[PDB]
Design a protein around this motif. Sequence first.
Motif, mmCIF file in Angstrom:
data_model
loop_
_atom_site.group_PDB
_atom_site.id
_atom_site.type_symbol
_atom_site.label_atom_id
_atom_site.label_comp_id
_atom_site.label_asym_id
_atom_site.label_seq_id
_atom_site.Cartn_x
_atom_site.Cartn_y
_atom_site.Cartn_z
ATOM 1 N N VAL A 57 0.838 -1.194 0.000
ATOM 2 C CA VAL A 57 0.000 0.000 0.000
ATOM 3 C C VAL A 57 0.875 1.246 0.000
ATOM 4 O O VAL A 57 0.610 2.208 -0.731
ATOM 5 N N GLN A 58 1.969 1.224 0.767
ATOM 6 C CA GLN A 58 2.963 2.293 0.725
ATOM 7 C C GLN A 58 3.700 2.364 -0.605
ATOM 8 O O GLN A 58 4.289 3.407 -0.909
ATOM 9 N N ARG A 59 3.701 1.288 -1.392
ATOM 10 C CA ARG A 59 4.220 1.371 -2.751
ATOM 11 C C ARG A 59 3.255 2.134 -3.651
ATOM 12 O O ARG A 59 3.666 3.009 -4.422
ATOM 13 N N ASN A 60 1.958 1.840 -3.540
ATOM 14 C CA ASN A 60 0.968 2.392 -4.454
ATOM 15 C C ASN A 60 0.330 3.690 -3.970
ATOM 16 O O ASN A 60 -0.280 4.394 -4.783
ATOM 17 N N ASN A 61 0.442 4.029 -2.684
ATOM 18 C CA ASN A 61 -0.006 5.349 -2.251
ATOM 19 C C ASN A 61 0.939 6.446 -2.711
ATOM 20 O O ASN A 61 0.503 7.587 -2.896
ATOM 21 N N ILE A 62 2.220 6.130 -2.895
ATOM 22 C CA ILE A 62 3.159 7.073 -3.487
ATOM 23 C C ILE A 62 3.157 6.966 -5.012
ATOM 24 O O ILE A 62 3.525 7.934 -5.695
ATOM 25 N N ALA A 63 2.713 5.831 -5.564
ATOM 26 C CA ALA A 63 2.645 5.679 -7.015
ATOM 27 C C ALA A 63 1.576 6.574 -7.628
ATOM 28 O O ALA A 63 1.774 7.102 -8.728
ATOM 29 N N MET A 64 0.453 6.771 -6.932
ATOM 30 C CA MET A 64 -0.564 7.697 -7.421
ATOM 31 C C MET A 64 -0.112 9.146 -7.297
ATOM 32 O O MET A 64 -0.649 10.019 -7.986
ATOM 33 N N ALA A 65 0.871 9.421 -6.434
ATOM 34 C CA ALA A 65 1.310 10.795 -6.216
ATOM 35 C C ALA A 65 2.133 11.324 -7.383
ATOM 36 O O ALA A 65 2.280 12.543 -7.529
ATOM 37 N N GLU A 109 1.565 10.125 -10.751
ATOM 38 C CA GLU A 109 0.703 10.185 -11.927
ATOM 39 C C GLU A 109 -0.126 11.462 -11.942
ATOM 40 O O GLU A 109 -0.235 12.129 -12.977
ATOM 41 N N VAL A 110 -0.707 11.827 -10.794
ATOM 42 C CA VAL A 110 -1.542 13.021 -10.716
ATOM 43 C C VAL A 110 -0.733 14.306 -10.722
ATOM 44 O O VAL A 110 -1.311 15.389 -10.860
ATOM 45 N N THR A 111 0.586 14.222 -10.568
ATOM 46 C CA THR A 111 1.444 15.373 -10.782
ATOM 47 C C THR A 111 2.153 15.325 -12.127
ATOM 48 O O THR A 111 2.865 16.274 -12.470
ATOM 49 N N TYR A 112 1.982 14.242 -12.888
ATOM 50 C CA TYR A 112 2.410 14.247 -14.283
ATOM 51 C C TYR A 112 1.241 14.548 -15.210
ATOM 52 O O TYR A 112 1.410 15.216 -16.237
#
Lengths: 52, 56
Positions: A20-28, A30-33
């Motif tokens: 979850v700590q892998r994918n909670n930062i993974a969305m951070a 994409e939404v800033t790209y």
Amino acid sequence: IDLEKSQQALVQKRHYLFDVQRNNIAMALEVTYRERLHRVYKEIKNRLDYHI
Amino acid sequence: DTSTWFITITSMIMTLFILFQLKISNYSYPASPESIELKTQKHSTPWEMKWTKIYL
């Protein structure tokens, strides 16, 4: 019995929340790209709207 | 009767209190058996607390 399952309870808990700590930062990123590609169209739409 | 002179029995009474302190010393008390069930409960509970600290 209750302390045998106390071993296995912490090894299904930990591998779920450590991805979850892998994918909670993974969305951070994409939404800033996605907002980086979108904003560079917005400030060139202002010049497409001003001179008319 | 009014007997006399006393050099008798009293030296043969303290040999008897080597016997009676030998037999009656090997007795069993029902109460001591209720005490060993208490310390077995708190030890595994702290061992489970040692296993809970092995979790936490």
